[PDB]
Design a protein around this ligand. Structure first.
Ligand SMILES: *[C][C]([O])[C]O[C][C][C][N]C(=O)C1=[C]C(C2=C3[C]=[C]C(=O)[C]C3=OC3=C2[C]=[C]C(=O)[C]3)=C(C([O])=O)[C]=[C]1
Ligand SMILES: *[C][C]([O])[C]O[C][C][C][N]C(=O)C1=[C]C(C2=C3[C]=[C]C(=O)[C]C3=OC3=C2[C]=[C]C(=O)[C]3)=C(C([O])=O)[C]=[C]1
Lengths: 433, 28, 433, 28
RNA sequence: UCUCUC
RNA sequence: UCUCUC
RNA sequence: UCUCUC
RNA sequence: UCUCUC
RNA sequence: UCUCUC
RNA sequence: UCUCUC
């Protein structure tokens, strides 16, 4: 590092203040919903609260709902399931809040500031949970992409309203999906790329293709994506080139940011415990999330005949965005063997409406890791016919044995300054296999 | 049967980044 | 030259008085820290002293630290490692000084004057050391720039508080990095370039772009940078133009000032030896630094299994800002073959806290050169679509064989007046390759 | 593999200022 | 080649 | 104010 | 492997 | 085209 | 009052 | 009490 330490501390202060805003907003909403400590630590209650906040600030959807009211749902109220424990058993109740009220509470929590960064953080946490839980092979096959490249679908469920953080965290496969959807839309109707809407669509196409270009690593991919962007009315050839680019990302990996976006319950508990994230600072890639997870208790609803350990592992991988990570390193860091998706005896965290909340129980989630490591936004050792041939040569030269991140290991929770790394010595390796 | 074929390295840890080479290169 | 000799002598007197201030400040601080002659000549002790001085006068960081106190570090004290030799072996101790005390000592050394020029000199020495030691390819890739243009990263670690000297010595690549960071910041948040802060940010953008314009050599680059500056809310097109401008600087080199900013230990030894820099004068580009280095002994700490010759070469290149210079001319001037960075068996000069100061030894640094030469602020023989095509034509016309600095050679240490140059006759040529 | 590609002339000495022409011009 | 500077 | 690993 | 996103 | 005039 | 060649 | 076309 260098004199950029001051810049590195201002960013820490800003992210700490956003975490403080999230936590104290959760505290205020828990007080306004009359939830006890146990219910306030429920992951489903936190998910519902977060979804209500995100729905309250959705400008486009709210405007459309206002202009086209839904069936029996007024466009000025939000809500979701609230799980409250009475006489030992759980019970769900649908709550309804005015969206102006939710926006006012959120603004008051952040000292009268909009703070869209906090909303983006909550959305990224939701996207990480969805990526760690569900496979969207249906959207892959519908768009023509191979369902085998599910490892490139990082941040696929993120809405467009996410800012630069959403673009940074979303993977190459999702960018290819968005571009291919635009290609198909232009193929269906030729009035696309033409007129006043043509300008806006071309601008959006330009911008998404530019940031996909910035996402790649090697020069050949970075030039083929530029060739794809240059075509004014792209057709099947550009779609095929994008397919090839996505396929090449499995070996020539692209740089995708990974951040530890925790559920709002953890931040609320930390703020209630007296932690000042504004003073101490925060970092989504450092020890700060791992340390916070170590000292926090979070409860979750367990469906009948389900394993709490599997659900805790799922929630942990969602928290650390380790859905597509190598299983060996995930198990090494966590200290408990991480079971692939096929052998997880658990369904999604969110509980459907058509469920009987009388055979359901709550289990404490073990969000503890034996070691901690720094999350990276980098790929690995990545060292129109001409570009395709060059890329094929590069992929053929690569092997699944080259060692990447040489000299970088895993640290202990006591090693806050990352002084002494532990290089692992190395079973299954794919989660979604 | 389809499934995950590559690995995306979220953690900065000395690794080998596995991928299923015969199936990926079979497409060309 | 001409009647500007008097002006050329006043500048010499002023820089001599700043060198005298630095040296006698170092002498006073050595007396206040109770360091012997051997410890006073240690390069690590000088680095620590210089860092304490620079930290004491940092207005913005001190104000922020005062308003937001750190964890266990009061914002009114500075310090750093002090290496003292006892019973033959070395030993480190963390020293702590009041910042008011350091400012008072600095002002008393410079006859009650602030003398920010001396602080800028110390900062430039630190920046030259950092450039000669470490590669910031990480900041290059993070900002989107190619990590191949590391030769344009001269003066990258310089803080913003450096005056006109910092802007003169910093390279074209660092200016492009600063501009690109501003571009990215404006792209992320559109409230940039708008409001009261918008005025300040536009003013800073204007000024940095103007001095980048002044840094270039050919008219086409000087006009493209002006085109980039004119856009009120610059976006991706301006960022791409800046990338192209930086890439063109590898062939159409820009004028970057090079100065020999020596460590404070050398100036302190010279002041103790009785040299009057105020009377004799000084010049950061002439023989004065080379002559001073010839007569000075400086010691440095050698880690176990390290080569003192490689560390001495690194310190020499840091002193003369020859990090990005052609290796052939550097070896010709020094008289000893200069080994590229990849084959240097040495780590950085600064010793980390998590090091065992009992297997470490001290070695005398050979800061002697067979010849001496005048450092130049010039490029070489450098003789929106239209501007880009013109620049591409200019770069294609250029070859890596054109002889620049025709008739200008290297002088002997006896030739103080540069009467008889020695044109070298010409192996590796890149340090960071 | 990346690395230094140009030379910045700190010293005022008769030189040729090497640079790797094929790699620099390959970008265009 | 991003072990942290969103 | 919906839901679903493949 | 498309239980709905033409 | 800055072989010294920060 | 930190640290690191790529 | 110096010197140099670009
Ligand atoms: C954290 C950090 O590092 C990050 O970095 C990277 C990122 C950058 N940023 C960017 O790129 C951005 C983008 C965006 C977008 C857009 C724009 C414009 C238009 O038109 C369109 C678009 O689209 C999109 C995006 C994002 C995401 C997605 O997905 C899509 C932005 C906005 O939007 O604003 C910003 C930034
Ligand atoms: C030595 C000699 O020769 C030198 O010359 C050249 C230089 C001149 N100067 C200049 O340019 C300057 C600059 C500056 C700056 C600024 C200003 C203003 C605003 O706003 C902003 C800015 O920024 C910057 C700078 C510098 C550097 C950097 O980096 C950035 C100055 C101040 O600041 O003061 C001065 C001078």
């Amino acid at each position: 590092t260098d004199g950029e330490r001051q810049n590195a501390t201002e960013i820490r202060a800003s992210v700490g203040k956003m975490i403080d805003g999230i936590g104290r907003f959760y505290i205020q909403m828990c007080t306004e919903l009359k939830l006890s400590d146990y219910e306030g630590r429920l992951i489903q209650n936190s998910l519902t609260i977060e979804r209500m906040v995100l729905s309250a600030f959705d400008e486009r959807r709210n405007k459309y709902l206002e202009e086209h009211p839904s069936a029996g749902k007024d466009p000025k109220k939000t809500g979701g399931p609230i799980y409250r424990r009475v006489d030992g058993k759980w019970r769900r109740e649908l709550i309804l809040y005015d969206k102006e009220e939710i926006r006012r509470i959120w603004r008051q929590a952040n000292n009268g500031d909009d703070a869209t960064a906090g909303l983006t953080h909550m959305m990224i946490w939701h996207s990480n949970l969805n990526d760690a839980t569900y496979q969207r092979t249906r959207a892959l096959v519908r768009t023509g992409m191979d369902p085998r490249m599910c490892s490139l679908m990082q941040g696929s469920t993120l809405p467009r309203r996410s800012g630069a953080a959403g673009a940074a965290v979303k993977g190459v496969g999702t960018m290819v999906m968005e571009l291919i959807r635009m290609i198909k839309r232009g193929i269906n109707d030729r009035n696309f790329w033409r007129g006043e809407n043509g300008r806006r669509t071309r601008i959006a196409y330009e911008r998404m293709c530019n940031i996909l270009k910035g996402k790649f690593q090697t020069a050949a991919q970075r030039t083929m994506v530029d060739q794809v962007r240059e075509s004014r009315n792209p057709g099947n050839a550009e779609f095929e080139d994008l397919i090839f680019l996505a396929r090449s990302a499995l070996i020539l990996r692209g740089s995708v940011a990974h951040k530890s976006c925790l559920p709002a319950c953890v931040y609320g508990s930390a703020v209630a415990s007296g932690y000042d994230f504004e003073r101490e600072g925060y970092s989504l890639v450092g020890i700060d999330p791992f340390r916070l997870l170590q000292n926090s208790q979070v409860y979750s609803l367990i469906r009948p005949n389900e394993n709490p350990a599997h659900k805790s592992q799922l929630v942990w991988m969602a928290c650390h965005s380790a859905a597509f990570e190598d299983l060996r390193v995930s198990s090494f860091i966590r200290g408990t063997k991480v079971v692939p998706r096929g052998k997880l005896s658990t369904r999604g965290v969110q509980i459907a409406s058509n469920e009987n909340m009388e055979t359901m129980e709550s289990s404490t989630l073990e969000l503890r890791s034996r070691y901690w490591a720094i999350r990276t936004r980098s790929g690995g050792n990545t060292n129109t016919s001409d570009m395709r041939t060059e890329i094929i040569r590069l992929m053929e030269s690569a092997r699944p044995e080259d060692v990447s991140f040489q000299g970088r290991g895993v640290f202990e929770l006591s090693d806050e300054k990352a002084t002494s790394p532990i290089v692992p010595s190395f079973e299954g390796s794919y989660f979604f296999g | 049967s389809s499934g995950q074929i590559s690995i995306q390295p979220t953690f900065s840890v000395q690794r080998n980044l596995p991928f299923d080479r015969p199936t990926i290169m079979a497409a060309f």
